[PDB]
Amino acid sequence: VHLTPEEKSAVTALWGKVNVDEVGGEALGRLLVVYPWTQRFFESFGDLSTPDAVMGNPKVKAHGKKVLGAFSDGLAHLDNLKGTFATLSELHCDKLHVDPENFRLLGNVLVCVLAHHFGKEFTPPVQAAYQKVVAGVANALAH
Amino acid sequence: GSNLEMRLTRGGNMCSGRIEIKFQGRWGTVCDDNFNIDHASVICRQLECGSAVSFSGSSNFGEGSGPIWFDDLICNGNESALWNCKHQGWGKHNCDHAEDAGVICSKGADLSLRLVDGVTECSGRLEVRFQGEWGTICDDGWDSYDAAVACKQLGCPTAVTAIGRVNASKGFGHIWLDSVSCQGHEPAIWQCKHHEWGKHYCNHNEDAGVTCSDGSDLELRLRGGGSRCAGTVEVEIQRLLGKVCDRGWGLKEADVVCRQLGCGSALKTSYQVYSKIQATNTWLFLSSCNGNETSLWDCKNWQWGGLTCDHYEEAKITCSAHLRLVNGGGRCAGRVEIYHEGSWGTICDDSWDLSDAHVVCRQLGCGEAINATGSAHFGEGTGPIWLDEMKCNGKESRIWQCHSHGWGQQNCRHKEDAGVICSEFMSLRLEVFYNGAWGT
Amino acid sequence: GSNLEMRLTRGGNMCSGRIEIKFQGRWGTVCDDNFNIDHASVICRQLECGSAVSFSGSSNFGEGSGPIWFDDLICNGNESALWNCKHQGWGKHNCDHAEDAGVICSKGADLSLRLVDGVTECSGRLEVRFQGEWGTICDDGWDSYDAAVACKQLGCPTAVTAIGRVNASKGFGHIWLDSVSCQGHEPAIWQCKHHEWGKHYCNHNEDAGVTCSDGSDLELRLRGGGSRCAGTVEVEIQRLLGKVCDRGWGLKEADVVCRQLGCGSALKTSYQVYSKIQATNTWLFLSSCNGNETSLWDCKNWQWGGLTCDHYEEAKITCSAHREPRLVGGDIPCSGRVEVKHGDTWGSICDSDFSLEAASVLCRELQCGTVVSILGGAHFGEGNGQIWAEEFQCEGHESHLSLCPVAPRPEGTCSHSRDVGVVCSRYTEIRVELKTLGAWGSLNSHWDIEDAHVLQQLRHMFHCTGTEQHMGDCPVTALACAGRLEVFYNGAWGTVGKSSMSETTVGVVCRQLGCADKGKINPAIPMWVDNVQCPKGPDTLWQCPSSPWEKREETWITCDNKIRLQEGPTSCSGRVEIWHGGSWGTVCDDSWDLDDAQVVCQQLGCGPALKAFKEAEFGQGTGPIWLNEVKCKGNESSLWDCPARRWGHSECGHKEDAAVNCTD
Amino acid sequence: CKNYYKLRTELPECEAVCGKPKNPANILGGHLDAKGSFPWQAKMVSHHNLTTGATLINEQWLLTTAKNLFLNHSENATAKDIAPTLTLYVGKKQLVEIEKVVLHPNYSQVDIGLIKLKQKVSVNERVMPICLPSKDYAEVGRVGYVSGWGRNANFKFTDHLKYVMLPVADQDQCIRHYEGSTVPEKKTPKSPVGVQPILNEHTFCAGMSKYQEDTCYGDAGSAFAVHDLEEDTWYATGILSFDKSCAVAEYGVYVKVTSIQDWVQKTIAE
Amino acid sequence: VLSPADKTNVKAAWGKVGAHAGEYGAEALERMFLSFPTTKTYFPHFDLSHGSAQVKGHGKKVADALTNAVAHVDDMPNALSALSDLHAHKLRVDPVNFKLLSHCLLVTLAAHLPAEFTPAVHASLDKFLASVSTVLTSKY
Ligand code: HEM
Ligand code: HEM
Ligand SMILES: *[C@@H]1O[C@H](CO)[C@@H](O[C@@H]2O[C@H](CO)[C@@H](O)[C@H](O)[C@H]2NC(C)=O)[C@H](O)[C@H]1NC(C)=O
Ligand SMILES: *[C@@H]1O[C@H](CO)[C@@H](O[C@@H]2O[C@H](CO)[C@@H](O)[C@H](O)[C@H]2NC(C)=O)[C@H](O)[C@H]1NC(C)=O
Ligand SMILES: *[C@@H]1O[C@H](CO)[C@@H](O)[C@H](O)[C@H]1NC(C)=O
Ligand SMILES: *[C@@H]1O[C@H](CO)[C@@H](O)[C@H](O)[C@H]1NC(C)=O
Ligand SMILES: *[C@@H]1O[C@H](CO)[C@@H](O)[C@H](O)[C@H]1NC(C)=O
Ligand SMILES: *[C@@H]1O[C@H](CO)[C@@H](O)[C@H](O)[C@H]1NC(C)=O
Ligand SMILES: *[C@@H]1O[C@H](CO)[C@@H](O)[C@H](O)[C@H]1NC(C)=O
Ligand SMILES: *[C@@H]1O[C@H](CO)[C@@H](O)[C@H](O)[C@H]1NC(C)=O
Ligand SMILES: *[C@@H]1O[C@H](CO)[C@@H](O)[C@H](O)[C@H]1NC(C)=O
Ligand SMILES: [Ca+2]
Ligand SMILES: [Ca+2]
Ligand SMILES: [Ca+2]
Ligand SMILES: [Ca+2]
Ligand SMILES: [Ca+2]
Ligand SMILES: [Ca+2]
Ligand SMILES: [Ca+2]
Ligand SMILES: [Ca+2]
Ligand SMILES: [Ca+2]
Ligand SMILES: [Ca+2]
Ligand SMILES: [Ca+2]
Ligand SMILES: [Ca+2]
């Protein structure tokens, strides 16, 4: 569905202050900590048992940076999300066999991370806008 | 043994067809289980037929007949022969003859590219030929690099490459290519990374196109706004009319359009209608670009046609080239207003003499004072009284540093807000009123 | 037996853990069924491990392996070994391996208690040692009984045993005890009922503590409100200054605090800020106070520290003795000089800073009804003591003088010769005997049952309706402006007898006619009434006892001037004052030009005006401000004819009282 | 006869093959079933759209739970009106009509019901019955694969089939977790989830895997497929009964298929 | 499953939520209504606008229920038995809405308590909310 111009402006303004080098790593670490079965796909990233080990893993931080770059790319093309995420969806579906629900889990974890870093600035309206954003990202990245 | 002759049967030529290996004096086929591009590349290098174009496992080449030698193979790509991977046993399988795997190699491939249903020979709905069959391309992942690669492969002026089929309708048949990923240096379109041939998750509505041009036939202007630099964005590409859709269209591309027309920056995405304009089937969709570019064609990945701007609206643009004294009747006279606690406040005229007037006039730089008016001479102020009894000696440069009763400590009302008339205050009525005296 | 050996498994040390008994060369456990401290004592004594600290039976030390040996052991405590009580079989049991019984013995646990990081040797975070390592106590279920048990266990004052660590931070290490349930008499904290050692979900922010004090170093006071008992509550417990968190702080706990300080009831959970107060990081947290407690220290489970009062404010309060008024020097009950107790000291009030709103609040608070008049200039006598320089900015509807906004002034206001006096309505003084004229007379000619009902408060003809609280509110019957006194009764007019006509009666007549406060007797229809004697307090003549109506050389009176000039060298110069509404008021100077002065001068009786002064030339006046912005035309006979913002509701102050200077 | 089939005759009869998936494998958690490694798993949808699970056991029958067949039905409802209600999906989305559904005689103690299709399903790489075991693979420590069409970590019915590798747990530990103390007079409703399971001698339990992933609502009826490495055959060791152990209750209760094998054979032979 | 460390983290997090629980629950309900409009179909008689009094009261009730569950974290099926029967039979709330509300509560706690929403505490709170949702939807 189309996103309203006010929601687009709020999303872009909130994403402008997002630390690209750290927010994605935070989201990926929180995903691997809260949902431990997501650590199955990152068995090559080293120690992933302790939550401190997951959050402090340099490979997890780098992959979170890449994930957040992909989110930024999908944000720049919010209206054409299937096209920009077609290759990533194919990669996750075939080479990695990542369940589509893991994308929604990572989206919700990212929403929680954004709320955590932005405090009261993450108002219910901008949260709804980002929920639409992450739902679109997960749908475009699935099947 | 090391004497296993391998042949391809019923696939047009020697390099394309269903795999068939001769072992133990009998010819046997190969299963399609866990069959990917690595196994196809191994097969192609076995026959010295080059790279692996694709693979087929649905027995499209034809039903086989014989002992299927291989069922499951774990090939990383670099093998001296097909009989080197983890073939999980020889002859053992769980297939039937309907699961036999084919392969199409580069040397025997008849791959070709063409453009159909376009304004010129360098634009339209791109199509590719696979297994002698012409099919279209889905537009997912189809970026400007893919457009440039296709333009170079076809061969015609490719200075400006634009995605999006020009006025082209949906194709027919198969979608042989999808999610093309080119870095812009591949000699052809099939050397790029993409999905398996035939396998896709699109429909014919999303048929990818291309617009190869040298940049001399791309024109843009604003129509319907009367002036040259206000109105909807009309697009002329290869003598074809068009209008810009507002999907992914902010102010950043609007100022790019304005700069291209040469009318400063962009003000708003709206205009006052002057005349009616026609509606064109094709549209210009702008994904995103930085906004500092000197022209609209010069920023990355702008789609020209190929989609319907029905859910969205036409893109409009209108370029840039389409302490204090209050209520005193002057500058150095009026109610003495002080600021405190984020609110403007007044000073009660209790024991307000000419010393306080001198202090407040010199603090404001208005020289000395002529009068110390009371009883709200310049109107009653609207703000809590801060100072009540001013005991300034007439020499200090600030009013708040005097012997007052403290901020908020008062027993007065706003009906007696203190006011002063400094010497520098001037009034005109010919008579001029300076230094508290009227004169010619 | 003599061939059976037992051990305690998985308990940290050899004197704690699961009970395991060897029989037929197999290690087996014991059920928790009918298991109590007697079995644990028997087992601990058998192993030479001392007494039984506690017993556990839910396999808290893990689930054992092997055959359960005993199910229902009946042990009275004095047994040589576990395999000697009656039980119900050797290996017969309706048990599982989740019912393994475990014991903790005295010499294994090696328990002790101490208080760490407090303001005194008997306050702060409570720490218990279990199996050689010190651990804190979770404050869940921690109350005054637990604190009393702990304080008496450490052997130091137990007069008041509060909970909560005084200022100690979170402890480090284990948290052993949780939900300690003491009755207040156990020898130590671990003989009480509690959760099993270490089994809880408490963080170290919930460390429990005690404040063992001998009821002598607990101090409470209010600071920052300009009086002894109005302001922010500031508790001083063992030299540690702290405040009270206002979570669950209403008028009940506020009343408890006020009674503790000795200032009656609590009226407001706030105060007028007079001075700042020191910031204190420790707080007092009240759970619930009944309201009848003689002190706040007698409330139930008041923590002294140990929590954060972040999203709650300090407890503010204003007791009903901040400004507690009283009327003294008045012969009748509800009149006299105003004296207001600023916390603990009685002092008079100057007449220049007591408006009719403040007097109405005074009369209402003192259960004296409405205000009749304000008598300035020390009418009821010179008050000895001090004069409060506070100007009461009463709105007129406040229940008490304590709730009135107050604007103190630095300079002295006046001498004791200008003490304010207030006369309220309820002057009845009835106890049936009633007191008027200084005589205790006895009132049934017109005494109905409604009068008896009103007499709720505990020949005059009371007319009570049975609803008003006081007999004063009852309309009582007991019976230009210069000439013969005429009274209207039974539809006919008649004179009033001059016999026994005191000055008080003439003053009452003049005030009722609304043209003076006093009067005089002058020489000269039938006569209706005679021998009228008015007591002090009634503003009307019909509340004065007299001889009965006898329809059958009379009271010619000349009321005093409604307008007078005060604090002047002569009788035709000074601050202008007028009489209206019962009390002598003043006239503000707003647009007080020479026409107003001319009108005033020709109303006083002497000649023309000279200069109309402004801004209290002769000083601030008494009573309220009646007239302001008077637009006299210069020809009005009296000041009452000129248009103005007449009779109250004036925004002027006593500093702007107008004045005139007339010819002598 | 063709692949995925065997000839049952000493004119002849060609029947399906016991649990020999085309591509064998190696629900809150992951393990997306991308390769179609569980052909026996079937999706059962009730009238009010609660997806559940059922397991192919032969070419025409399916094992599920009586609690699954009684969704949107009265407790007194018989088996005649249950059959028209259910819609059954095998393979990708292949809808299969249900001829009749027969409940277990002791469906309050053995949570099993059989589903008989109108016609024998076409066995292929995505549809293939699992084989009823000849041994007891429910011995503690065995790891079985539990496919599932039930809810996921978001409590949303999973779009794609998933599976987990759940190891069977000690029975006494499972009853102790759900009931009280494995003895009738001390058992109490101590389930960490509100509802309590049907635990008896006919059911075993399998705990969560190493990633704290378990089976949630809708996973009931899904076979506890056990890979027998000796003969490379997949055996439905148990049918998941207590699916309400999403991640709170540590054990899912699976009714042993060996205990019900006699009854299912007597049924699969009218 | 809620480990003892997870229960400890949940208890600490809800204790430091403290008195703000009512408006935390109101904000969580508002975030659920805005982000997920499909959850508004269970409150047809509610004023669903921002700052609503009825939504604030229901959020206070929800937060009180969650506090009761935290206090009875070892006995949640009994502490939430009445709520379990309610949500499972009378309202018939689909469990996906419960997961949405759990996510919105987590977002509210992250926005209001950033210094204490550590990954371990976030995981523990998610586990506790999953346990509450499973208890409430068990009889569904
Ligand atoms: C939800 C939004 C997600 C986005 C936008 C995203 C994006 C990406 C990107 C940019 C890559 C790098 C591709 C490459 O290096 O070639 C990648 C790979 C990968 N993704 Fe995701 N991802 C998402 C979610 C997930 C989730 C939820 C999981 C697992 C539960 C996951 C698992 C992986 C793995 C294992 C890789 C390969 C890592 C490697 O090869 O070292 N991703 N994804
Ligand atoms: C952690 C999750 C939840 C908790 C702790 C919770 C708790 C509560 C509580 C305490 C009540 C009040 C019952 C009463 O006053 O009798 C209630 C009622 C209700 N709940 Fe929930 N609930 C949760 C999830 C949900 C969700 C996700 C929905 C819908 C999307 C929902 C829908 C309702 C409705 C419709 C009511 C009835 C309110 C009314 O009739 O005014 N609940 N719940
Ligand atoms: C709590 O307060 C007490 C008393 O103020 C502190 O104990 C004092 O600590 C200082 C160190 O700065 C010593 O010099 C004093 O001798 C101590 N007094 C007593 C009576 O022991 C205690 O440290 C504080 N605890 C905290 C802040 O955690
Ligand atoms: C099976 O599901 C249907 C649809 O959910 C239920 O029908 C609803 O029943 C409730 C309660 O009686 C009504 O309020 C709804 O209006 C019904 N919806 C319809 C008829 O579309 C039906 O009750 C369920 N069967 C049961 C619970 O036995
Ligand atoms: C697109 O335009 C070209 C040139 O005008 C024309 O030849 C072609 O038929 C058009 N295609 C359509 C209308 O589909
Ligand atoms: C626009 O800005 C980008 C920075 O992202 C820069 O790379 C590019 O060269 C700029 N283009 C022009 C025309 O200045
Ligand atoms: C100012 O002062 C002069 C002389 O003192 C006087 O004549 C004049 O009227 C005054 N004006 C005001 C506005 O006070
Ligand atoms: C206070 O009242 C309560 C009941 O409200 C009573 O139990 C208690 O004994 C009373 N205490 C005093 C000191 O009157
Ligand atoms: C009133 O006026 C006379 C004459 O101007 C003067 O002598 C007298 O002092 C004045 N009164 C006062 C109180 O100053
Ligand atoms: C179940 O879903 C179908 C759509 O797949 C719909 O037609 C039907 O009405 C739904 N039934 C109920 C009871 O919601
Ligand atoms: C049901 O239980 C009875 C005894 O409780 C048993 O005899 C019978 O065989 C059981 N039913 C089946 C189908 O086994
Ligand atoms: Ca195959
Ligand atoms: Ca195979
Ligand atoms: Ca597309
Ligand atoms: Ca003044
Ligand atoms: Ca001055
Ligand atoms: Ca003053
Ligand atoms: Ca027991
Ligand atoms: Ca017993
Ligand atoms: Ca506590
Ligand atoms: Ca009477
Ligand atoms: Ca004035
Ligand atoms: Ca006048």
What DSSP line would sit under D182-247, residue for residue?
A: SSTTT-----SSSS----STTEEEEE--TTS----TT-TT-EEEEEETTTTEEEEEEEEEETT-SS
φ, ψ at C352 (rounded to 5°) = -85, -5
- Say if CB D239 and CB D63 are below 8 A apart: yes
Burial of B90 per CB tally in 10 Å (0-12, 13-18, 19+): middle
3-state secondary structure of E9: helix
CATH 3.10.250.10 domain residues, chain B: 6-105, 112-213, 218-319, 325-439
DSSP reduced 3-state for D62? strand
Do the chains contact at C96 and D185, CB–CB below 8 Å?
Answer: no
Beta strand pairing call for C133-137 and C174-177: parallel
Give the CATH H-level superfamily of domain D143-259: Trypsin-like serine proteases (2.40.10.10)
Resolution (Å units) = 3.2
d(CA C517, CA C571): 18
**What distance in Å separates the CA atoms of residue B193 and residue A42, rounded to the nearest whole number?**
24
Position of tokens 């199409």?
B104
Residue C545, CA distances (Å) to C534, C535, C539, C542, C614 in order: 7, 8, 13, 8, 46
CATH of C6-106, one of 3.30.70.330, 3.40.50.720, 3.40.640.10, 3.10.250.10: 3.10.250.10
Q: Which amino acid is at A4?
A: T
**B121 CB-contact burial (10 Å; exposed 0-12 / middle 13-18 / buried 19+):** exposed
Spatial separation of the C-alpha atoms in residues B162 and B300, rounded to whole Å: 9
Q: How big is the CA angle at A24 (ends A20 and A26), to the nearest 5 degrees?
A: 120
DSSP conformational letter for C382: P
Give the SS3 label for residue E1.
Answer: coil
Cite the DSSP H helix spans in C82-131.
106-109
Residue of D nearest to A107 (CA): D154
* Ligand 9 center–CA C661 separation, angstroms: 7
CA distances from C267 to C230, C243, C313, C395 (A): 10, 19, 18, 16
Domain boundaries, chain D: 5-17+40-129+262-267, 143-259
Tokens of C233: 């509550």
Distance CA(D175)–CA(D197), nearest Å, equals 9
Alpha helix (H) residue ranges in B117-194: 144-154
How far CA C515 is from CA of B273, C30, C32, C518, C558, in Å, comes to 81, 104, 97, 9, 10
Rounded-to-10 torsion of CA B301, B305, B307, B312: 80
Q: Whose CA is nearest to atom 6 of ligand 5?
A: B119
User: Which one of 2.40.10.10, 3.40.47.10, 3.40.50.970, 3.40.50.300 gives the CATH number of domain D5-17+40-129+262-267?
Assistant: 2.40.10.10
Q: Are D256 and D268 in contact (CB under 8 A)?
A: no
Radius of gyration of chain A (CA): 15
| Helix segments in B47-161, DSSP class H | 144-154
The CATH superfamily assigned to A1-143 is Globins (1.10.490.10)
Beta-strand runs (E) in C70-132: 102-105, 112-116, 123-130
Q: Smallest Cα–Cα separation from B70: which of B80, B84, B59?
A: B84
Distance in Å, alpha carbon of B30 to nearest chain D alpha carbon: 15
Helix axes A20-34, A58-76, angle to 10 degrees: 110
Quote the tokens at residue D234: 């997949």
Spatial distance between the Cα atoms of C252 and C288, rounded to a whole number of angstroms: 9
User: DSSP code of A96?
Assistant: I
Q: Looking at residue A93, what DSSP letter applies?
A: I
Runs of H (alpha helix) within C276-431: 356-365
Can chain D be said to touch chain B, i.e. do they have 3 or more Cβ pairs within 8 angstroms?
yes
Angle between helices E21-35 and E53-71 (to 10 degrees): 120
Which region, left, alpha or beta, applies to residue C638 given φ > 0 means left and ψ of -120 to 50 means alpha? beta
Tell me the fold of B6-105: Mac-2 Binding Protein (3.10.250)
Q: How far is B3 from B25, CA to CA, in rounded Å?
A: 11
- The reply to whether residue C99 touches residue D181, judged by beta carbons under 8 angstroms, is yes
Domains and CATH numbers, chain E: 2-139 (1.10.490.10)
User: Is the CB of residue C105 less than 8 Å from the CB of residue C50?
Assistant: yes
B282 φ/ψ sector (left φ>0, alpha ψ -120 to 50, else beta): beta
B300 lines ligand 6 (CB under 6 A): no
C-alpha dist (Å) from residue B70 to B30, B74, B84, D21, D246: 5, 11, 11, 17, 42
Amino acid residing at B429: R
Q: Cβ of D126 under 8 Å from any chain B Cβ?
A: no
CA distance B250 to B256: 10
Non-local (6+) Cβ contacts of D260 within 8 A are D63, D104, D110, D112, D202, D239
| Architecture field, domain C563-661 | Roll (3.10)
Does CATH number 3.10.250.10 belong to domain B325-439?
Answer: yes
Q: Which two tokens stand for residue E119?
A: 């990954």
Q: CA gyration radius for chain D?
A: 17
Across the interface, do E2 and D248 touch by the CB < 8 Å criterion?
yes
Taking CA atoms only, the protein residue closest to ligand 7 atom 11 is B371
Say which residues have a Cβ less than 8 Å from residue C416's Cβ, sequence separation at least 6: C348, C378, C382, C383, C384, C387
CA separation, residue B87 to residues B48, B64, C111 (Å): 22, 19, 69
Three-class DSSP category at B78: coil
Cα–Cα dist B214/E61, whole Å = 68
| Closest to D65 (Cα-Cα) out of D167, D198, D173, D168 | D198
| D181 in contact with C, Cβ within 8 Å | yes
Q: Which helix (H) or strand (E) holds A56?
A: none
Distance D186 CA to ligand 19 centre (A): 9
Write phi, then psi, for B314 (nearest 5 degrees). Answer: -65, 150
Q: Report the SS3 class of residue C109.
A: helix
Per-residue CA distances from C144 to C203, C291, C556 (Å): 21, 18, 79
Residue C389 CA, distance from chain mean position: 24
Positions at the binding site of A for (2R)-2,3-bisphosphoglycerate: 1-2, 82, 143
> Which residues, in sequence order, are CB contacts of B1 under 8 Å at separation 6+?
B23
- For residues B288 and A76, is the Cβ–Cβ distance under 8 A? yes
User: Do C589 and C658 form a contact (C-beta atoms < 8 A)?
Assistant: yes
How far apart, in whole angstroms, are the C-alpha atoms of residue D64 and residue D149? 13
From the centroid of its chain, how far is CA D72? 20
Q: What phi and psi, each to the nearest 5 degrees, are found at residue A126?
A: -70, -30
The sign one gets for the Cα dihedral C195, C199, C205, C209 is: positive
Class of domain C324-424: alpha beta
Q: Is B411 in Cβ contact with C407 (below 8 Å)?
A: yes
C-alpha to C-alpha distance for B285 and B302, rounded to whole angstroms: 6
**Strands, E, within chain D: which ranges?**
5-7, 14-16, 41-45, 51-56, 61-64, 87-90, 94-96, 98-103, 113-117, 143-148, 162-167, 203-207, 223-228, 233-242, 251-256
CA–CA separation, D240 and D226 (whole Å): 13
Q: Å from C308 to nearest chain E CA?
A: 9
Q: How far apart are CA D105 and CA A27, in angstroms?
A: 51
Contact C18, C101 (CB under 8 A): yes
Give me Rg for the CA atoms of chain E. Answer: 14
Same CATH topology for D5-17+40-129+262-267 and D143-259: the answer is yes
Domain C111-213 adopts which CATH fold? Mac-2 Binding Protein (3.10.250)
Contact indicator for C542, C557 with CB cutoff of 8 Å: no
Chain D residue numbers with beta carbons less than 8 Å from the beta carbon of C98 are: 176, 180-181
* Distance (Å) of CA C93 to CA B310, C68, D109: 80, 7, 27
Which residue is associated with the tokens 């007044």?
B346
Which CATH number is correct for C482-558, 3.40.50.300, 3.90.1150.10, 2.70.70.10, 3.10.250.10? 3.10.250.10
Alpha-carbon distance of B209 to B306, in angstroms, equals 7
**Structure tokens belonging to residue C463:** 């007319």
Domain B218-319 falls in which CATH fold?
Answer: Mac-2 Binding Protein (3.10.250)
For A128, the closest of E35, E110, E126 (CB atoms) is: E35
C144 vs C132: CA distance, rounded Å: 27
DSSP D51: E
How far apart are alpha carbons C275 and A32 in whole angstroms? 55
Distance CA C360, CA C355 (A): 9
Query: Kindly report the CA angle at D91 between D88 and D97, in degrees rounded to 5?
Result: 30
Residues 312-351 of B with CB under 8 A from C: 350
Q: Do the two chains C and A touch, given a threshold of 8 Å on CB pairs and at least 3 pairs?
A: no
Q: Which of B205, B124, B217, B219 is nearest to B166 (CA)?
A: B124
Q: Do E and C touch, counting CB pairs below 8 Å (3 needed)?
A: yes
Experimental method: cryo-EM
Instruction: Give the pair of three-digit tokens for residue D14.
Output: 């060609």
Do residues C600 and C573 make contact, with C-beta atoms less than 8 angstroms apart?
no
Which chains, if any, share at least 3 CB pairs under 8 A with chain D? Answer: A, B, C, E
Interface test with B, best of A75, A90, A93 (most B CBs within 10 A): A90
Closest CA to B221 of B229, B211, B210: B229
Task: Retrieve residue B429's tokens.
Answer: 């009525």
Packing angle, helices E4-17 and E53-71, rounded to 10 = 140
Other C-beta atoms within 10 Å of B426: how many?
14
Nearest alpha carbon to residue B243 among B196, B282, B291: B282
How far apart, in Å, do the first and last CA atoms of chain A sit? 18
Closest to B252 in 3D by CA, of B266, B263, B238? B266
Q: How far apart are CA C444 and CA D104, in angstroms?
A: 97
CATH number of B112-213: 3.10.250.10
Compute the distance from residue C527 Cα to the ligand 21 centre, in Å: 26
Domain boundaries for CATH 3.10.250.10 within chain C: 6-106, 111-213, 218-319, 324-424, 482-558, 563-661
List the beta strands (DSSP E) in B24-117.
26-28, 52-56, 102-105, 112-116
Contacts of residue C279, Cβ cutoff 8 Å, sequence gap at least 6: none
Antiparallel, parallel or unpaired: β B123-130 and B243-244: unpaired
Q: Which residues, 6+ apart, have CB-to-CB distance to A73 below 8 Å?
A: A84
Please report the beta strands in C539-629, taking only residues with DSSP state E, as ranges in sequence order: 556-558, 563-566, 573-580, 583-587, 625-627
Tell the residue nearest (CA) to atom 3 of ligand 7: B371
One-letter amino acid of C517: D
Are D83 and D75 within 8 A, CB to CB?
Answer: no
